[PDB]
Structure 1
Amino acid sequence: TTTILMLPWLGYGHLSAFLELAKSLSRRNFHIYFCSTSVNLDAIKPKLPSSFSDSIQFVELHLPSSPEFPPHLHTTNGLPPTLMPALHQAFSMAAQHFESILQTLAPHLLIYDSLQPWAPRVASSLKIPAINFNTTGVFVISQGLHPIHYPHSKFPFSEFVLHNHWKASTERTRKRGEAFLYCLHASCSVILINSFRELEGKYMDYLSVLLNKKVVPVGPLVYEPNQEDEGYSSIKNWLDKKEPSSTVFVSFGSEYFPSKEEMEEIAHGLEASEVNFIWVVRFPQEDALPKGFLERAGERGMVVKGWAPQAKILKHWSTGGFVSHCGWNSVMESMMFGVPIIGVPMHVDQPFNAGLVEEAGVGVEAKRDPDGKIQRDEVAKLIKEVVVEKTREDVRKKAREMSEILRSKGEEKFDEMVAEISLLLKIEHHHH
């Protein structure tokens, strides 16, 4: 009877994190209007069981469309990188439809993602409380805000150094302005963040000071797969043949297409390691591999095209490593399932995520050269040490300990969020 409209950013990782939060809120008696573009809603629907049909309603947000930019392309998932400016521009023009949705549905609360300036603002003009759910980690945000207040001083609690490659406009201009966003309401005085104290507790305390905001951990939000084959049955038979802890899963996410040069280094490092591997290779919605590489690999390697059951593969006992771009959800999934990460970060928050994995001791990062390039030798050495020869038992011990901590978490994970939301509603009700 208390309704919440949830608005993820367009992007599969954001959609997944919001959906898991939606399920918890639905179980706690909130009615959820889960709002996204049709293609994203369709992509995420397999993960919502029929049990939620009454409580979580999928609500379509309409973006401007054209015959060459139809609604199927209204997502970052597999989007050609050049079409990305159109996606932000079309999303920029979806505010009027969003306003119509809010006026009609009249939700008691809005939970919104961090790439929609208009979303809280539209909610505000209709006197609807709104709260920010940040689907990614704490470490990156605190590192972003720390220079503002301390241009000369050292970042506390970490020895991480950003590589010069990442250290080196319209979105950047937008992000900087967002650092100085004001708050005169209860709803904007707290944020929900998809992390947990055993990994980021010090950073969460620091972030709250930097923001003057309550920081509520609600994570990690890891989707647990069930018993349609998206190729698992074929893959499960292949994995069953392998030795325990002998295989690496290779993925670079739902939004990034590695360069021909980058994938050459990844493939050569994979071949030199002599590891088993399942590599998901994607093309905008082999010809990108070194010649003879898949033949030289033979049955040691399997390439899955387009999409793979990532969570299921990570849970298989043959999997001993995750060569990953270190997108937050993949990092959270690997930690939940106890698979050590061999980090190959690409852009955005991923280098920060790789550093976090490295200090925690659960995984390792393949360092780039001074010119910012992937190194096949570094890729080969880490897979040999972590997976093939298992000379990094410290990393494997830390990963298992971390998994046990994460598995140990129960429904208390959401208690602080529930208490804050109830306060939010009671306060804003009086001031309308």
Structure 2
Amino acid sequence: TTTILMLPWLGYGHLSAFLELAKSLSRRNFHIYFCSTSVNLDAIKPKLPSSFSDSIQFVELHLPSSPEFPPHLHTTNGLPPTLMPALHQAFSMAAQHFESILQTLAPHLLIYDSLQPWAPRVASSLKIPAINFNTTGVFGISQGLHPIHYPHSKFPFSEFVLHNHWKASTERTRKRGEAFLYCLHASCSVILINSFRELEGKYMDYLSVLLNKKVVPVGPLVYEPNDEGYSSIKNWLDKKEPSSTVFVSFGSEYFPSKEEMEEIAHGLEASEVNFIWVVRFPEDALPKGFLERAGERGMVVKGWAPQAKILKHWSTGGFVSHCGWNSVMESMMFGVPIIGVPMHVDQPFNAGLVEEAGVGVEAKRDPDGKIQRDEVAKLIKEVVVEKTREDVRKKAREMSEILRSKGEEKFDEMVAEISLLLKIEHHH
């Protein structure tokens, strides 16, 4: 049996996408070692059906631990952002344990994420072929690589303009970019990416030319379940009108500021929409009286919600999203129009891609980068409450139809490249 060890970055969204890719590989009769920190393995295990456990085995990676940085914090999930430097540093210090794991398990292939340049180096030292898998889409990566090669030309295949809020140490930034690009460039023969050609084909081809490396899409990778609070939520959703409710979430690794929560809350209130809002803490940052005024229209879920089940509910008409890539792919698979409120990293690019696909809208920030309650209210009003953006709802339905027609064949290209790479390296 051919064995693959998979090393996601320590972010719940990365674990999620890597687990869906592991399932696709298990169905092609690979044996998978799924490697992460215990706190991340615990978080993702509920998403693995028992039928996979014979072929997808979890393997704990150990980071340096201390009372001030214990194992429960060895994840980005709900991590204070000022511990993010420590998390990256501790992950790099796991390379020795990672080498021991690779020596013991001797997988035929490593699949690694883009936040760990040390991982392909350890694999190479053990003569283990290694392929990079990106859990993001292509658009934002190509937008980041383009100015390196064409600093005085506009990106060629879009009308997207990055807002100044995101455009604003330079050396530290260059080194982070170099480490990220190294993970892609170091990949053996191909880069795998969680995207699909109907959405990003021309950006895939452009990225491939810029990197001079083959880009192989393996998306859409969307988890679908079959009671983490769902029964109460379902009963509440069941009593709403069709497509009347927005889900509101900013993902697993971001806490909006009190100022940002103020604007989102007032936007939800003015829109008069039904809403389910996931609020997380690393105190109450909602405006005084907001929930009491919302009454039965509003529901705040503390900590974590069953996002997929909510998005699939007939009562859900829109998704106010930070536009993390898994949330975007889920919303497209499920046919739910996105009202984009991106926060940082790849999110502003994901929102512009959503807007340019016509399957959602982006709430624009003010010149100084502040969220606008009037823009949130307007877009929820148009897309969900009044549904005067029929064009967006139609495009979102059409995208869901395309994504639902995809099957196992979306993994054919990856499987062929794995087969070739292993047949070549066995000779070497």
What TM-score, normalized to structure 2? 0.97
User: Contact between 2:20 and 2:223, CA under 8 Å: does it hold in 1?
Assistant: yes
C-alpha distance 170-92 of structure 1, shift in aligned 2 (>3 A): farther
Aligned partners of 1:81, 1:60: CA distance in 2, in Å? 24
Q: Quote the offset at 1:335 in angstroms.
A: 0.2
SS at match of 1:181: helix
- Which range is displaced more, 94-103 or 177-186? 177-186
For residues 96-117 of structure 1, the C-alpha deviation after alignment (integer angstroms, 9 at most, x for no partner) is 1001001111111000000001
User: Contact between 1:187 and 1:424, CA under 8 Å: does it hold in 2?
Assistant: no
Q: Quote the offset at 1:148 in angstroms.
A: 1.5
For residues 342-376 of structure 1, the C-alpha deviation after alignment (integer angstroms, 9 at most, x for no partner) is 00000000000000000000000000000000000
For residues 320-345 of structure 1, the C-alpha deviation after alignment (integer angstroms, 9 at most, x for no partner) is 00000000000000000000000000
Q: Quote the offset at 1:147 in angstroms.
A: 1.0
C-alpha distance 33-182 of structure 1, shift in aligned 2 (>3 A): closer
Aligned partners of 2:373, 2:172: CA distance in 1, in Å? 32
Give the share of equivalent positions with the same residue, in percent.
100
The answer to whether residue 236 in structure 2 is matched with residue 248 in structure 1 is: no
Q: Quote the offset at 1:35 in angstroms.
A: 0.2
Q: Quote the offset at 1:238 in angstroms.
A: 0.3
For residues 380-426 of structure 1, the C-alpha deviation after alignment (integer angstroms, 9 at most, x for no partner) is 00000000010000000000000000000011110000101001101
SS at match of 2:162: coil
RMSD of aligned Cα (Å): 1.8
Instruction: State the partner residue of 2:265.
Output: 267
Give structure 1 regions of 4+ aligned residues with deviation exceeding 6 angstroms. Answer: 179-186
Q: Quote the offset at 1:170 in angstroms.
A: 8.6
User: Contact between 1:186 and 1:427, CA under 8 Å: does it hold in 2?
Assistant: no
- Give runs of aligned pairs for residues 2-151 of structure 1, distance below 5 A: 2-151=2-151
Aligned partners of 1:124, 1:140: CA distance in 2, in Å? 28
Aligned partners of 1:184, 1:372: CA distance in 2, in Å? 31
Q: Quote the offset at 1:155 in angstroms.
A: 0.9
C-alpha distance 217-185 of structure 1, shift in aligned 2 (>3 A): closer
For residues 274-316 of structure 1, the C-alpha deviation after alignment (integer angstroms, 9 at most, x for no partner) is 00000000000x7200000000101100000000000000000
- Which range is displaced more, 165-174 or 271-280? 165-174
User: Contact between 2:112 and 2:119, CA under 8 Å: does it hold in 1?
Assistant: yes
Aligned partners of 2:187, 2:3: CA distance in 1, in Å? 15
Q: Which structure 1 segments of 5+ residues have no match?
A: none
User: Contact between 2:114 and 2:183, CA under 8 Å: does it hold in 1?
Assistant: no
SS at match of 1:420: helix
Q: Quote the offset at 1:165 in angstroms.
A: 0.6
Q: Quote the offset at 1:178 in angstroms.
A: 2.8
For residues 129-169 of structure 1, the C-alpha deviation after alignment (integer angstroms, 9 at most, x for no partner) is 00000000100111111111111112111000000010004
SS at match of 1:182: helix
Aligned partners of 1:172, 1:8: CA distance in 2, in Å? 23
For residues 217-249 of structure 1, the C-alpha deviation after alignment (integer angstroms, 9 at most, x for no partner) is 0001000111xx111100000000000010000
What TM-score, normalized to structure 1? 0.96
C-alpha distance 184-18 of structure 1, shift in aligned 2 (>3 A): closer
Aligned partners of 2:249, 2:16: CA distance in 1, in Å? 17
SS at match of 1:132: strand
User: Contact between 1:245 and 1:387, CA under 8 Å: does it hold in 2?
Assistant: yes
User: Contact between 1:114 and 1:134, CA under 8 Å: does it hold in 2?
Assistant: yes
User: Contact between 1:367 and 1:378, CA under 8 Å: does it hold in 2?
Assistant: yes
Q: Quote the offset at 1:269 in angstroms.
A: 0.3
The answer to whether residue 327 in structure 2 is matched with residue 330 in structure 1 is: yes
User: Contact between 1:278 and 1:304, CA under 8 Å: does it hold in 2?
Assistant: yes
User: Contact between 1:225 and 1:312, CA under 8 Å: does it hold in 2?
Assistant: yes
Aligned partners of 1:420, 1:354: CA distance in 2, in Å? 31
Q: Quote the offset at 1:189 in angstroms.
A: 2.3
User: Contact between 1:361 and 1:399, CA under 8 Å: does it hold in 2?
Assistant: yes
The answer to whether residue 295 in structure 2 is matched with residue 311 in structure 1 is: no
User: Contact between 2:244 and 2:385, CA under 8 Å: does it hold in 1?
Assistant: yes
Q: Quote the offset at 1:68 in angstroms.
A: 2.9
